[PDB]
Amino acid sequence: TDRVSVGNLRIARVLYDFVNNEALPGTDIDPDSFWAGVDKVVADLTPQNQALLNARDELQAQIDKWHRRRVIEPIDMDAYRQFLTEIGYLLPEPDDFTITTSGVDAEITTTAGPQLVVPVLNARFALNAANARWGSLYDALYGTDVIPETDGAEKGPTYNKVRGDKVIAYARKFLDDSVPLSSGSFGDATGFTVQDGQLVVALPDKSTGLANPGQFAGYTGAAESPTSVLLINHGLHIEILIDPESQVGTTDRAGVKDVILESAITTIMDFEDSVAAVDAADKVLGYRNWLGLNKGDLAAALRVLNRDRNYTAPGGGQFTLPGRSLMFVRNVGHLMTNDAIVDTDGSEVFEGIMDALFTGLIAIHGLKASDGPLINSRTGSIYIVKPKMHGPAEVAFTCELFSRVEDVLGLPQNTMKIGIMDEERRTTVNLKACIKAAADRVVFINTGFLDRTGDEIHTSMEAGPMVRKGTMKSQPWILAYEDHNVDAGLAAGFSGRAQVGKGMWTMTELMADMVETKIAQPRAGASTAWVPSPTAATLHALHYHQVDVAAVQQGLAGKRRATIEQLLTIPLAKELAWAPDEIREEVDNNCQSILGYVVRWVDQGVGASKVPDIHDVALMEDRATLRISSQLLANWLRHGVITSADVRASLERMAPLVDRQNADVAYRPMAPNFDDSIAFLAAQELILSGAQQPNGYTEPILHRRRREFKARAAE
Ligand SMILES: O=C(O)C(=O)CC(=O)c1ccccc1Br
Ligand SMILES: [Mg+2]
Ligand SMILES: [Mg+2]
Ligand SMILES: [Mg+2]
Structure with a gap:
């Protein structure tokens, strides 16, 4: 060998x-x-x-x-x-x-x-x-739904200043809540300096320091006009990047470019x-x-x-x-x-x-x-x-x-x-x-x-x-x-x-x-x-x-x-807990998530995938979430909540939908030739054999099916 x-x-x-x-x-x-x-x-x-x-x-x-x-x-x-x-x-x-x-x-x-x-x-x-x-708070806020895409603040091909401003405001509030000023808000800051080793924040009318000067951890650049200010709160660092020359900083009241979070x-x-x-x-x-x-x-x-x-x-x-x-x-x-x-x-x-x-x-x-x-x-x-x-x-x-x-x-x-x-x-x-x-x-x-x-x-x-x-x-x-x-x-x-x-x-x-x-x-x-x-x-x-x-x-x-x-x-x-439409939704949702995850596992060797569920919610799937879905259906089948025809029908119904979502490139459709698809048969096996897997673990079937797929590919 x-x-x-x-x-x-x-x-x-x-x-x-x-x-x-x-x-x-x-x-x-x-x-x-x-x-x-x-x-x-x-x-x-x-x-x-x-x-x-x-x-x-x-x-x-x-x-x-x-x-x-x-x-x-x-x-x-x-x-x-x-x-x-x-x-x-x-x-x-x-x-x-x-x-x-x-x-x-x-x-x-x-x-x-x-x-x-x-x-x-x-x-x-x-x-x-x-x-x-270390990671950018502005990027995290701008790039996700934390800032709603209401009228005016929608993302697009280019920078949206209206959304940018909401990002800025969100972060200013974070600073007030985390590293409070003696008086005034960071929202009204016009500058930062270090004098006698102490953080001084310029407000429109006066100047102020932190309620707790101990939260001032350090800085970069010159003390008289730092290029950044490092704060600490609850043991975690916060860095305000000061750069009036930048796009964002140009628009900012204190020339702030970003807030970086540990x-x-x-x-x-x-x-x-x-x-x-x-x-x-x-x-x-x-x-x-x-x-x-x-x-x-x-x-x-x-x-x-x-x-x-x-x-x-x-x-x-x-x-x-x-x-x-x-x-x-x-x-x-x-x-x-x-x-x-x-x-x-x-x-x-x-x-x-x-x-x-x-x-x-x-x-x-x-x-x-x-x-x-x-x-x-x-x-x-x-x-x-x-x-x-x-x-x-x-x-x-x-x-x-x-x-x-x-x-x-x-x-x-x-x-x-x-x-x-x-x-x-x-x-x-x-x-x-x-x-x-x-x-x-x-x-x-x-x-x-x-x-x-x-x-x-x-x-x-x-x-x-x-x-x-x-x-x-x-x-x-x-x-x-x-x-x-x-x-x-x-x-x-x-x-x-x-x-x-x-x-x-x-x-x-x-x-x-x-x-x-x-x-x-x-x-x-x-x-x-x-x-x-x-x-x-x-x-x-x-x-x-x-x-x-x-x-x-x-x-x-x-x-x-x-x-x-x-x-x-x-x-x-409880007895009689579910109307037929509810049982149907649970079955279809579980089969969709199982097939979505398993098809990429078996055919492509990918062990974590974002799989939209039946509500179109993107879920990061791993073996544990598969363990739940396969075991739940195994349990329902075991106790007569659903029939073997119900399971097969749901698998066949959801499979083309999974195919569509993957349609790219190293992907091979499961439908319509279900018995020819090692991935489909793996999904089926996880459910129909689930009660017999040790502690319901998914690996024995996944590993066997992946190895089977690789063998066919090599021949
Ligand atoms: O909850 C557990 O069993 C885990 O151990 C979770 C887990 O690894 C996981 C679940 C979904 C997505 C990513 C991961 Br790393
Ligand atoms: Mg506290
Ligand atoms: Mg785990
Ligand atoms: Mg037994």
Whole structure:
């Protein structure tokens, strides 16, 4: 074949060469020692990895049966809880404790702000994301619907001054609200100066300073007429760019050209739900981008990584600020294998194990000088998001894997830190124990509410028909889950030490709506939450200026706002809940979103796509949102809400509509020859086989179908 033999492993040549030629050089790790380490870790840890996956299946089978043997209508919560406890699903809560994780950067322990997630296989997106630490407020406002396109203020081929003025006014109000003047408004400012190290703002009638002179962080240019003024509020920087010569500045009362916000404080470079990588070739593409990010030389077309930013302190001396988003990497979880490496028997190696080895290896570069200062962690940490874990034993396993990898890489123990996704029910209900299992590695917890919703549906699949997808966000279980997560983090001493994060805004074009509603997340004490783009990061930063998360967290301390009973409230629908038109809409909406996402996954290897839903709302789709849709339809089919003819008819009805939306270029229509389309059959399979997928996961089918598509293409 095209494999390299090391011990009991047979490594795809493309991966072997990448590691030897590109990843290892510069780390001072001996190539032969590295590969011996891979062999040993894989051999040592594979058995427990398999045992954990088996335990999931066993627990689900018992719960399935428990529901089928229920006669009593209103589910008996006391009995249900006792059953979960008996089978080892619900474990004892440990005594209070405080996490001890150290060597963590300020962006994580202390700074509250947006966290951006981006597919690592897309180099351009990854570059923009790394560079999203700073972003233009004017661009974000002008370019989105945050400023309405009412009569007069519509966007067009050229600059609209009426809209420009609304942008200016919006930002002036932001400044008044965030960094207030002693008296007067920024709206009436005519200039800025620095005298005796103090910010002085010219008003038409008098001059004034900040209500809080401490918010003045520095400036650029001459003190007598700065080219910019740097402010700080709630730990985040705001920069007013002063330039009367510019188009916008010419029209401005104080010659202001733009207001720049510190935006995406940290970014997660994703190997998991937002990318499609099903073999060694795909994995290498991803690994190479992560390498380029950490070595600091990733470049497109040239677009490159930003350097740090230089400022003068109020007093006159010099300082710098980070120009890049501090990077995490999201590895895949414990489920999947990948044929990038197979053993002598031809068995595929667990992908999570490989990701820890290879992403960890590559991250070493980000800890050292780049052709420039080192790119990433100045405190010496590697930041890894670990998704889709179920319960404390699975967290303990991730910790043991990272420990073994550190030994192979010659890194200090606990270098590799863990961002824990709380996105599976068996983690939610055992959250305190999960944090404790990683007490010296954890750098965040985050409510991955989309995956968590998929797991909610699958876990209780046999219980009955679930409510419509759009109803889930307001169900008792999810509201308890969100508060429970914050409570556990604060109780474990996260304030000042680790992020308490919440989930993704998927409506990429609904920025007015995002600005209105996502403020709920920091108001709930989350020190970070997920955004889908650098523009959304800049707009979400507004919320952290309005809400003092540090104060909110202090206020929430010691509260227990969710009960186990509330967490365990299954979102069953009521009898006769739906008219036919409602059922039809749910079916068509789900099939449309499934087909829209899956067609690009299977035929083009794209793991995240904007897919208009049935209401024509552009939604960023990833595997988690697919997990929900496929599981919901699987559940409705299982309980007789819909028939197999209903499903097939809906798929065939929506497919041509998806074809139309993709009609460009490497796209192959699904209709009318449905049985000839691997993409269509994948979509169908996710629904018709959904109840039989482990925990409702979409990867086994997606990976199989993508590999099938590639094989046909090659023949
Ligand atoms: O909610 C969860 O399960 C996630 O983990 C979300 C997620 O990755 C995502 C969902 C939609 C669009 C982009 C992303 Br990065
Ligand atoms: Mg079964
Ligand atoms: Mg997730
Ligand atoms: Mg405040």
